[PDB]
Design a protein around this motif. Structure first.
Motif, short mmCIF file in Angstrom:
data_model
loop_
_atom_site.label_atom_id
_atom_site.label_comp_id
_atom_site.label_asym_id
_atom_site.label_seq_id
_atom_site.Cartn_x
_atom_site.Cartn_y
_atom_site.Cartn_z
N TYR A 1 0.80 -1.23 0.00
CA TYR A 1 0.00 0.00 0.00
C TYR A 1 0.84 1.28 0.00
N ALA A 2 1.94 1.31 0.74
CA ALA A 2 2.80 2.51 0.75
C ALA A 2 3.50 2.67 -0.58
N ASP B 1 6.72 2.82 5.26
CA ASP B 1 6.88 3.83 4.21
C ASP B 1 8.34 4.14 3.87
N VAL B 2 9.27 3.79 4.76
CA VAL B 2 10.68 4.13 4.52
C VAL B 2 11.50 2.92 4.04
N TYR B 3 11.28 1.75 4.63
CA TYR B 3 12.05 0.55 4.28
C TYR B 3 11.25 -0.46 3.44
N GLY B 4 9.98 -0.13 3.18
CA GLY B 4 9.15 -0.95 2.33
C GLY B 4 9.50 -0.67 0.88
N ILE B 5 10.20 0.44 0.64
CA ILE B 5 10.57 0.79 -0.72
C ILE B 5 12.07 0.54 -0.95
N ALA B 6 12.48 -0.74 -0.88
CA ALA B 6 13.87 -1.14 -1.11
C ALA B 6 13.98 -2.41 -1.97
#
Lengths: 11, 308, 310, 309, 9, 307, 308, 313, 9, 11, 11, 8
Positions: free
Chosen positions: D209-210, F302-307
């Motif tokens: 979701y994020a 939101d910070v480490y889910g995008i790696a």
């Protein structure tokens, strides 16, 4: 045509 | 007009004798006034019979009650039960039997031994199922008598179970033993299922079938023989006794008053084969022995009707 | 120094062929550099093979990876899988198995058919039974080739299961077959139990056994005779091989229950793992759980007419 | 006059095509004499369709039974399911469906593949919901065909699920999505609660979701916009067709017709209408796991929209 | 446009 | 040689103060003669502080029992607790807490307010977990003081809860925050699972995270930058905690404790739960603890889910 | 004549105090118009009083609304409730209590402390149980204020509970304490069987009785006669008294169909025993204390009346 | 050199008498040659005795099998058992016991009454347990006779059981009765929870206790005394020899647990050994004739008595 | 700067 | 001494 | 007559 | 001497 053996522990 | 009940405690005594030499004459002495009668074994508060008799209060006082008190009471005095040393010892069994049946009565203390007790009339209205069950028991009383005599002069009680359930399955099923032998196994399986030595039980019972394969298989054809057609007594009697009940079963299944526990097939047979099991309890066969017998029956039908 | 992982997708072709004519020559090519190698079947993102090879990073780049890309690649181009018509048909089952198995990863879309992929090294250094398991798989790879080849050439896969299950039961149990025929029937009973039509299944399996009893017992004595032999010349070949290969895994396991390593434990404890390993081999050979249970059940029954009348 | 039931077995074939190219023709070819008919997907004894037709016993043997046997069988013989190799492999699925089910029909053996069976007439009495339910299914059959077309022509099924779930929740609840998003989250939470890897899952869905927050939020606004009417076709089709069932439900909770399963008008008519939407999603061939992921996504999407207020 | 529903992208 | 225990009742008064303006100076007095001491909040027979000090019998009677009787007992006279209007109102909560925590003492009557009470020595034999715990508290008592000063100085308490429990996760874990965030969420979830309005609560916590996203996302980035070297308490707490981590790893490589794999996510699990036990020491309620972990995990997403 | 309720939020402060300096004045200021007016204490959305009163729509808007919001409202601004730290800290008790009573509703958030809030006429379930029970709440509202400032002085609420329950068991059963002690244990043995440390509590409690034995054997013999005599102990004969109209009222209503001589006997038995327990809850002793008291009574009972 | 088995059927006869007048003499008759013997009661195929003696086969035919057939067979002729009325009346209870004790063997038809059958030897190796048990049974045999001979003259068997049970918990536990009474209560409560009329039988017991409080408490004070003293005598002998004979068994069991050869029958040392030894006591009382019900009643009364005596201090 | 923890803002 | 049958639906 | 002892952890 | 063992 006898009666059936029924001692499951006969051995 | 009413169902009157009697309890006869006979705790250690030979319940077959009390039946043959006590209750059977008593039941004859009032046949003329009261031919609808049966009796059941039970364990609660001590091994005891329950007597079921249908008449008026008037015939009750005049002929039935004096018949039971004098003839059954006579048996009791001549051959009193010696009793049980320690009734509490039986709770590992009764307590288990009480949840299994859904009993809900006290299990202790035991009613006094060698004693007849009037229990009055059966609350009141009966189910259609009850009426049909009471009648099954009624009409099969001589068959009980017929078995207990043979057992008393030597016969194997299990072999009689064997012959009875096999023949009920062959003669009164939709299509004989090849289809009905399933229900047999299904009956044994439901017990193995709930026993924690289930798998070790199955090995005992299958080794035993293996040791004795041609005994059980030759016995099975013979029972299968007499069911359809002159060489086995009780089998053909047991069948002829039972066929009018399943017809009565099918009719009241179709009209519809029962199905709480397509329909004259797997319904009439379901009821009559389960009445056969209730007969074997009446004969004094334990659940364990009955399940065993049923298993060996099924296995023997595998080696017969499995090589199709 | 590590375990390196490859995935080869083969959704709808003869998986045994890929194993015998792709994976086996490729393994033969880097054996001298890296002889700890094995492979497992698996369902996620389309039926695929999972290759596990133990070597250093420099060896992977220089010999292992090129062997697999070229040799297995050749098989894949010569003999491609046709593919599965509609993969979503399997999605509800795959969601369920991913739950029961603790399988994290995507389930759809499937990985492209007829394709290889490097999946890197195994997480971080492993548990104790893990390592015992890889050793077992590695050591029984020739056993896999021999069976798969014999099957492709017309031998009955369920019979091989039969022999190997009987043999492991007899040779590596404390009491041998007469005591351990119980464990066999039990393993079949867990499945008959968990199954809404068990009663009808038991009838079928006993009808079957009945209809063919002598074959199953003569065969049972055979595997048993061969499994306890010791003389490299008894009725059946693989059975001694299998026993001969299994023993020191059990030994490593009994010792590995006689100093608290993983979970009475000298006895029925390492034999429990050794028979689980046998069951894991059969799955590797392509046998369904259903056929396994059926094998176990017929085996128990056969033992009754043998060890139950004396 | 009576509900007549047929079983079509199709274990491995593309269920969507049997529905579009088999059942749809058949249903049409007897529409005249019996247009009240629907179908469901089910798994028991093997993947299969269950065809429900309302008609007279005469009209059954006369026109519909031959339409199914010829038209559907035509489809079957033209494009048979290759069948599935090991039916017992599906036991861990069909037992865990058996529990949540409450069916206790025999899980096995499987009905034969690529075959039609007649199954007689539904029981004898029909609860008021049984009737109301079958009306929902019959009226939304065209919705089924329309979504599956798009799926066959490439469209994402989960996106369709999103639209329908979000749309229903806005248009047909008392307060719209601001209030209704709770029930969206509630449907996902009852599933996560029952799953041991629940936590790992919530992570997975929040990460996802994020990762795409702008997408899901702009999607949610777009759909909520077409409910209260637009850029989306199927959404208000969906609303329009559902509204009469929502209305009929309310006035059946008022007179008191189902008390076994304003807040008879509120969380009652909308509870049944959203459950209907979920039953519809199953009919489109969406797995439960996928439904639950779409709701949870709808809920988080609703948080960055109706929650900054 | 269609939403991305690949949780593991 | 032994552990001596004191009970300070302070029912309806600020415990933050009793600690910084009473117990801290009492401890500071006998620091020369008995440097091993720690204190814990508890609820039975009235809100109170239990003090635990490790010294000999007559060192107790000569320097510790007076320091406490006089320094602390002074504060009590300066700033007394008003008391609690009805002690019986807490009785059904406490009877529940009793069975739930295994607390074996009487619950009523309450012990007298603004009072010190010598409670002799602790049972006699202690387990090995008990005494790694005791050590952890003592070793961290400065950080209790460091933090309660800033709380009284105006700083949000939950924010220190945040940074601590975040930074513990990024530092003293096998694979940093991208892995350890799972444990944060797991922690909140065990709570939420047992609440009936768990769903409406998840919505509240998610709404709140939404409004103030840039806030939590910035601060997580900062606590993580600084746990691995522009913040004080972080690498104070980090450096203060590493020795208990690797001591704990040793104390399971040998195997004496997981009655209630293990060198990794077993050591860290011990460090992180002490980081929770610390937060209770700072007065943070269970509900705010869980609330803070939940916010971290979301933030972590939101910070480490995008790696 | 319709039951109008209210709600008084009062979290931290003495719940016994606004009963005595807030509710009692109010029930005077409208004592005449509407007679029957009782209160119960509860925890949902905050510890609070649920006040009830039977009356008319303008009777309330005229006197007893402005009565209740002048003196209760006069109090709530006099000694306000402090507030409570972590309302959510009660969830481990509140989640548990909901599942035993069955009652539904949001446990959180908490209704704003120190507020009166009017809440209407409660739904039609005007069954005779509740009416026969809301009699008793209001009829014994004296006995609540009564015992509550015996508590204010410094009497122990448990001791009172001991007194009332032992007395209740003694004068009110058919065969006195010698047979009604059984009643008292079952109430306790129901709690033991339901809880985790159940078998250890039974041990704590039985040990504690033997330590302090003659304290209980002697307070029982005393409580016994103050119920039995037609005065040593005040609050005892006074309670036994109020409760036997109400026993006789339930006596009658049971035989004649309006409720459910084996429940005219063990019928008005519990009706009045439970009222006691419910009274007890009103005084303010936790269910735990009640169960201990019942266990101790039954222990004490079995020493005095048990060698018979 | 191995364990030999004998079966003595004696269905409805006085069992306590067969023990003292038939079996004990036979045992003395070969007690120089085979000091290692013990007997057990069992239900299967009819109330009987199981005799175990350990010697060689050559001592067997020479001095042990003859002294059994002569002295035991001599009792059988002199006071033969009447017979049970109906074996099958017991079958369903026997089925249930066989599931419970895992027994194995025919339940029906019973062995012939008043006969003696030689059953041959126990398989090949015994567990560590069975070996300890056998030693225990042998070492406690004169404690059987003493108890039975006191029974034959009208001493209350429950009162013997009360003494033994109390003495073991006081002497062979760590804290004595103040701590160990708990294991006495626990045992009885396990039984009561099994009975659907537990709470009614409890107060029947808690009542029967209080009617007799003074008699129970002051015998428990007295039994505990003969259990601790530290002397070459006391005022209740048989308690003293019970304890003295169990202490080795406790020690040997704690040793055996510590080194790893048991855990079926700080904690698993001391506390495992206590439980084995209190369990051996219960197994003795069953050998004396005590019914499980009587045993649970006696434990329940011990724990009531202990609670009084050690609560009032 | 400190984080807001007021969730009924 | 060869392949065992294993079609259970032999009949 | 006095109040009752009611503390079960009085030891 | 001996203890009383009658229950009812």
């Amino acid at each position: 045509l006898n009666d059936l053996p029924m001692d499951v522990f006969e051995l | 007009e009413r169902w009157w009940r009697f309890r006869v405690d006979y705790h250690a005594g030979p319940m077959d004798d009390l039946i043959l030499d006590g209750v059977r004459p008593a039941f004859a002495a009032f046949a003329a006034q009261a031919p609808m009668a049966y009796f059941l074994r039970h364990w609660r508060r001590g091994p005891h019979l329950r007597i079921y008799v249908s008449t008026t209060r008037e015939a009750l006082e005049a002929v039935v009650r004096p018949a039971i008190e004098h003839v059954v009471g006579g048996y009791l005095r001549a051959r009193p039960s010696p009793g049980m040393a320690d009734p509490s010892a039986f709770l590992p069994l009764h307590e288990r039997l009480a949840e299994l049946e859904g009993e809900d009565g006290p299990l202790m203390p035991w009613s006094p031994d060698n004693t007849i007790h009037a229990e009055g009339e059966r609350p009141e209205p009966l189910t259609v199922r009850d009426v049909l069950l009471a009648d099954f028991y009624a009409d099969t009383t001589p068959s009980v008598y017929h078995a207990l005599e043979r057992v008393r002069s030597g016969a194997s009680l299990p072999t009689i179970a064997f012959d009875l359930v096999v023949a009920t399955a062959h003669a009164l099923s939709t299509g004989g033993l090849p289809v009905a032998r399933t229900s047999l196994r299904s009956h044994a399986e439901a017990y193995l299922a709930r026993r924690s030595d289930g798998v070790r039980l199955r090995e005992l019972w299958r080794d035993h079938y293996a040791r004795n394969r041609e005994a059980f298989t030759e016995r099975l054809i013979a029972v299968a023989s007499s069911a359809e057609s002159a060489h086995l007594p009780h089998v053909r009697e047991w069948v002829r006794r039972l066929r009018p009940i399943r017809e009565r079963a099918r009719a009241l299944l179709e009209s519809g008053e029962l199905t709480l526990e397509d329909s004259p097939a797997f319904g009439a047979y379901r009821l009559v084969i389960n009445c056969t099991y209730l007969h074997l309890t009446r004969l004094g066969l334990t659940p364990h022995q009955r399940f065993l017998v049923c298993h060996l029956a099924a296995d023997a039908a595998a080696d017969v009707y499995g090589i199709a």
